Amino acid sequence: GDVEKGKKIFVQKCAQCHTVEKGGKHKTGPNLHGLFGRKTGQAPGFTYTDANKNKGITWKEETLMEYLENPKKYIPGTKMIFAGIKKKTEREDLIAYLKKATNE
Ligand code: HEC
């Protein structure tokens, strides 16, 4: 877990689709300006699939670890064709940064 390291991990992994505040547009992932308490499906001005829509719980680091290790294991019928990430540190490092972004 580290905000500094995580700063450049999110984007290199997956900025092309997604934003944490600004600049990045609704291409193929919503701007994650509020996680960690905010819900699953209910993206601000975006067009998710009904698969994510059906999911109706809090996003949180707990849920994200599962989702980042393997999103297919949680919401597979979802447009996010994301492959995979480190394994076990990831869910701390990426999360370390995003827990900064959506929050301070
Ligand atoms: C473009 C090919 C993507 C990449 C690369 C990543 N994501 Fe993504 N994500 C994408 C879409 C189209 C969606 C919605 C799925 C649907 O049903 O249409 C998502 C969704 C998420 C969510 C959920 C947000 C919500 O509205 O509930 C999260 C938390 C998320 N994605 C995070 C995330 C991260 C951190 C990624 C890299 C590590 C990543 N995504 C890659 C498309 C794409």
Swiss-Prot record:
Subcellular location: Mitochondrion intermembrane space
Signal sequence coordinates: none
One Pfam assignment: Cytochrom_C
Residues recorded as bearing N6-acetyllysine in the entry: K72, K99
Residue(s) carrying N-acetylglycine: G1
Annotated keywords: Acetylation, Apoptosis, Electron transport, Heme, Iron, Metal-binding, Mitochondrion, Phosphoprotein, Respiratory chain, Transport
GO MF annotations, alphabetized: electron transfer activity; heme binding; identical protein binding; lipid binding; metal ion binding
One GO process term, biological-process aspect: mitochondrial electron transport, cytochrome c to oxygen
Chief location: mitochondrion
Binding site for heme c: C14, C17, H18, M80
Source taxon at top rank: Eukaryota
Sites bearing Phosphotyrosine, chain numbering: Y48, Y97
Modification type N6-succinyllysine: residues: K55, K72
Post-translational modification: Binds 1 heme c group covalently per subunit.
GO cellular component terms listed in the entry, alphabetical order: cytochrome complex; cytosol; mitochondrial intermembrane space
Family to which this protein belongs: Belongs to the cytochrome c family.
Miscellaneous comment text of the record: Mules and hinnies are heterozygous, having equal amount of horse and donkey cytochromes c.
Function: Electron carrier protein. The oxidized form of the cytochrome c heme group can accept an electron from the heme group of the cytochrome c1 subunit of cytochrome reductase. Cytochrome c then transfers this electron to the cytochrome oxidase complex, the final protein carrier in the mitochondrial electron-transport chain.
Name the UniProt record assigns to this protein: Cytochrome c
Gene this chain is encoded by: CYCS
